[PDB]
Amino acid sequence: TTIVGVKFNNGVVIAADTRSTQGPIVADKNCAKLHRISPKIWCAGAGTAADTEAVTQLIGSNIELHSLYTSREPRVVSALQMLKQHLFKYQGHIGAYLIVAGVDPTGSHLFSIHAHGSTDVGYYLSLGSGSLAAMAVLESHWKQDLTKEEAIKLASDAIQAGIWNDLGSGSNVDVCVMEIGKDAEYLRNYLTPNVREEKQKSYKFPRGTTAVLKESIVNICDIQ
Amino acid sequence: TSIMAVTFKDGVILGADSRTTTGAYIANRVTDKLTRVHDKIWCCRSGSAADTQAIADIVQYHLELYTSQYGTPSTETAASVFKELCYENKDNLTAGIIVAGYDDKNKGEVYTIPLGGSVHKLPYAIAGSGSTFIYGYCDKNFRENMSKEETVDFIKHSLSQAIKWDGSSGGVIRMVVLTAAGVERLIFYPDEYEQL
């Protein structure tokens, strides 16, 4: 579940593997790790995904009200100092370990979060099972005053390391990128590097094979 | 992990090593550990991190209204706020920290706070799981009423004395300053004190 975040000169970007696990066994070929709290803002949680999605679709509701009540655009920092206070109430039973990055009228931002509430900042981050490998790639390529289309590659090839050079990762890549004074581009399935090729035949069956004891119809009828 | 603070003639100083750890992985190596709790009050977050963030972020709330209602604060007032959160809730969290401030009338002051919760007066103070390696290499080099140039390197020669011989947790070094005139974040880099 290798994700990644990185800032550039006039915007930020994030990415994420699309491998699910009910342990070692997979349970979804692909799943949008990326989630929304607001249009410009986006976040990705690696850990217990059920505790990932609550906070997104929750905080995206406790803040959408705030924007309208304030008659003003949000700020991402507001999306931090409330969930930072939320998780600390529970002191770690929550299975959450997040990044979050976006855009606000005062600039751009990236932030990282852990469960107890230990938030930190930086121009580049990477989490999940492959937080190790994916951080090293971009260390070997990150520069100051980078530019947008240099990061889509640096951020994608990094988590390609989080696939091949890691176990629990998987197939595809999902990317979302922002930029000031512009909408939030959302790249779904930005690259499909592997493809489930075809086993050498069809192991199907023809009609009239099984043994059906009885049979009957069901109605979903109504008031007539 | 490795933080300390010292007073001098025309003000005081804080400092720290921008490094963290979980297990034995370099997670975030550029971290700040100094808090704008008020204009001329600061601190140093030693111990856990999930606790000291929230703790410090509270103390703004009580020092941002005490700023408003009742006047500009004093530094003695700060630790007697930190102390009341750390003593009364000692058996859940893990934090031990430092403060610093200044009045034009009463010169620089530095208090300290252990885990269990107890303020103390000190001119020089240290804290960190990996900063007990300095109690000798400072008690002899240290004096009072010195100045900016004399105490900056004093810190500098200490933290490398920590990290070189068996510090086990530190990165770059940074520091600040709290005179009567103003403040300024400083920054010193590995190549400086590494070859030192």
Binding site: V77, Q81, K84 | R36, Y189
Partner: peptide
């Protein structure tokens, strides 16, 4: 490679 740790004014918020 540790020359960019200067534009970090704090631990998420302050300025």
């Amino acid at each position: 490679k540790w020359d960019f740790a200067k534009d970090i004014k704090g631990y998420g918020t302050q300025k």
